[PDB]
Design a binder for this molecule. Structure first.
Ligand SMILES: [K+]
Ligand SMILES: [K+]
Ligand SMILES: [K+]
Ligand SMILES: [Mg+2]
Ligand SMILES: [Mg+2]
Ligand SMILES: [Mg+2]
Ligand SMILES: [Mg+2]
Ligand SMILES: [Mg+2]
Ligand SMILES: [Mg+2]
Ligand SMILES: [Mg+2]
Ligand SMILES: [Mg+2]
Ligand SMILES: [Mg+2]
Ligand SMILES: [Mg+2]
Ligand SMILES: [Mg+2]
Lengths: 46, 74, 56, 179, 107
RNA sequence: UAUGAACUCUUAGAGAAAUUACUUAAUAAACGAAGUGAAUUGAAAUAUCUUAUUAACUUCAGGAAAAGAAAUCAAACGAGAUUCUAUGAUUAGUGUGAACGAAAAUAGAGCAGCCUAUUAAAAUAAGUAAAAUGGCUUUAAAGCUGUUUGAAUAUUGUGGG
RNA sequence: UAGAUGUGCAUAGUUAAACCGAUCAUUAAAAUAAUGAAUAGUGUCUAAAGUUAGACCCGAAGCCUGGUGA
């Protein structure tokens, strides 16, 4: 069953784990942005 | 005996320039192990590689390749 | 900036062997000779062969 | 590699990276850096190990490991017989250290030394040299022996006699650096 | 009058033939009192017959002909359709040479 | 037909993109080539095989790229670079099988030849051709290749097929 | 104006196959000795079909590659 895994979650970890800089500065992150850019997403990160 | 054997290298042709003892006199052409020529003689300028171009300038041919003379002594 | 990029592509010219320089110089001379021209005197002698082998 | 110092030259043997760092004992004014002309055929896009030695046309190869009864295929690799050797350079007068294959050791013996193996102008050799051999080629060309040998072959081919040499620039930086 | 018609026939040839004949003109079309040894174009001095391999004097290495056996057959085919095949130099692709070698020697 | 203006981030450095701090700092995808390279699946199981020089990943590059003017094919007559489409062809052939699978030639789209390359290159190619061995490709040839060895000089018949 | 040009199928069968041929094959030589095999095709449309493709439709557990997340 699902669990409350977002309890006590902070937004400093969201930016570090899923933020824009976390992706433009990595090889695999660039692919993520380019995939989401091809699909037309407005929210590319976080 | 067999119709096919292990392929081996006989050596490299060189011409002496310093009258090395136990190997031959000056300006002597013969085949020597590549290690001695590559590590001992060539650095000390004791011999030179005999390339097809070197043969023409010296006017010699492949028939001049002699043999090592272990009995030679200056 | 564009002139520095140009000079970079042309930097290896200092690492050319004498034979390489000799061949690059002969092109400058060969290309200067041009293409030989056919004189109206020779063009006539060619037409004689065309008509002789076409009509008679 | 750890290369020796040339007996009577302030130019060191280049680094496999392409850099020619000068010792602080050599007075050089900043705004100056030794640049080697780029390798025409560019670096090798696979087996980057080959861009730091004399590998010839040898690279890492892939194939199968066929079994005996069922002939089952399994991928394997074939590596060149690369060795580290000290090779005499008549031009520099020292032992140039580099990684070389056994097939290139024979070619060096065939052409008449390391210096002759670097000065070849055929397209097949310039490809076999690689980025590293291109540097050693650039270095021996700065020596007075090769510069004198090339100057003698130019008049033999009918070329005009042949601006300032790199070794001279480093000499003029001394006379101007002390005073 | 006929002289003007002759020049027009020559100028009507394809540029590919006019180019070849310009740099490799045979003695047939040369001036009457001309001499083959002289009046040589810069190409004829480099290679008397551009269809045959030449051995460089300084370097004992044969130089490939300026026209490959494929390009030799294209000129012969192009020169035969315009009546100037007899103006080309010797070639193993000439229709008379191919035929002569078969009749003389056979299979 | 001209012309004024046209902010911030991606995109100096740093950072939690659209901030900081500076400054007349600036280039997605798809397509291309090479390298690496599966499995589902089919064979009514399954190893060779097939799936498949596939998908995918990495590197490099341009508006296209790649390839290209015969060390090509033919067969005793001759054709004459490369690329794309169709036929040839459920063919020759390979494989125990399941299946895989050309070329010549033909037709059409385009057509262009050259080295003095309409952008600036060769003194005509030696550790190469080729051999043994381990593999790839494959019909046993040809072609690619690690290791160990290693030629000849042109139809006045030298070299490759 | 004229010439040429452009898949294919059929028109002759027979045998493993060629030579051969209204005959051919086996008979280790051949021979009516014996046995088998000979006469309208081709194109198109309509419809039903075999084969290969998802192949009448829906439905796995699982396998592989690349990415995501402590
Ligand atoms: K490597
Ligand atoms: K063969
Ligand atoms: K028949
Ligand atoms: Mg859970
Ligand atoms: Mg927590
Ligand atoms: Mg040994
Ligand atoms: Mg930035
Ligand atoms: Mg900024
Ligand atoms: Mg089965
Ligand atoms: Mg078959
Ligand atoms: Mg050649
Ligand atoms: Mg080979
Ligand atoms: Mg083979
Ligand atoms: Mg071959």
């Amino acid at each position: 069953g699902p669990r409350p895994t977002m309890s006590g979650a902070t937004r400093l970890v969201q930016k570090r784990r899923h933020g824009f800089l976390s992706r433009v500065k990595t090889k695999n992150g660039q692919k993520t942005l380019k995939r989401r850019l091809a699909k037309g997403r407005l929210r590319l990160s976080a | 005996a067999s119709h096919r054997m292990r392929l081996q290298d006989q050596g490299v042709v060189v011409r002496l320039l310093e009258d090395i003892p136990k190997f031959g006199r000056k300006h002597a052409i013969f085949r020597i192990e590549r290690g001695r020529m590559r590590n001992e003689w060539f650095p000390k300028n004791k011999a030179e590689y005999m390339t097809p171009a070197r043969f023409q300038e010296l006017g010699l041919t492949r028939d001049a390749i002699g043999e090592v003379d272990r009995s030679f002594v200056i | 900036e564009e002139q520095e990029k140009e000079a970079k592509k042309s930097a290896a010219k200092a690492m050319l062997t004498p034979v390489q320089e000799y061949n690059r110089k002969q092109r400058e001379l060969r290309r200067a000779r041009g293409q030989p021209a056919l004189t109206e005197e020779m063009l006539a002698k060619i037409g004689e062969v065309v008509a002789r082998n076409k009509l008679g | 590699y750890h290369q020796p110092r040339v007996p009577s030259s302030a130019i060191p043997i280049p680094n496999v990276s392409g850099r020619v760092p000068l010792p602080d004992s050599t007075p050089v004014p900043e705004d100056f850096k030794i640049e080697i002309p780029s390798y025409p055929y560019g670096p090798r896009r696979v087996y980057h190990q080959s861009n730091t030695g004399l590998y010839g046309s040898a690279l890492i190869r892939f194939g199968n490991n066929v079994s005996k009864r069922n002939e089952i295929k399994t991928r394997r690799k074939w590596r060149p017989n690369v060795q580290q050797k000290r090779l005499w350079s008549k031009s520099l007068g020292v032992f140039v250290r580099t990684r070389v294959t056994t097939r290139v050791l024979r070619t060096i013996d065939k052409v008449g030394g390391l210096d002759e193996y670097l000065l070849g102008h055929k397209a097949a050799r310039v490809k076999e040299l690689g980025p590293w051999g291109w540097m050693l080629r650039w270095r021996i060309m700065q020596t007075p022996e090769i510069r004198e040998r090339f100057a003698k072959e130019r008049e033999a081919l009918g070329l005009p006699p042949r601006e300032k040499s790199l070794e001279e620039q480093l000499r003029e930086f001394q006379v101007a650096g002390i005073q | 009058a006929t002289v003007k018609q002759h020049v027009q026939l020559a100028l009507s040839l394809p540029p590919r033939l006019r180019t070849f004949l310009a740099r490799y003109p045979p003695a047939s079309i040369l001036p009457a009192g001309a001499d083959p040894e002289t009046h040589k174009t810069p190409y004829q001095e480099e290679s008397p017959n551009p269809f045959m391999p030449t051995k460089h004097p300084i370097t004992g290495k044969w130089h490939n002909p300026k026209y490959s056996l494929r390009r030799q057959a294209e000129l012969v085919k192009l020169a035969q359709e315009h009546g100037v095949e007899e103006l080309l130099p010797f070639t193993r692709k000439l229709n008379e040479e191919k035929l002569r070698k078969r009749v003389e020697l056979g299979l």
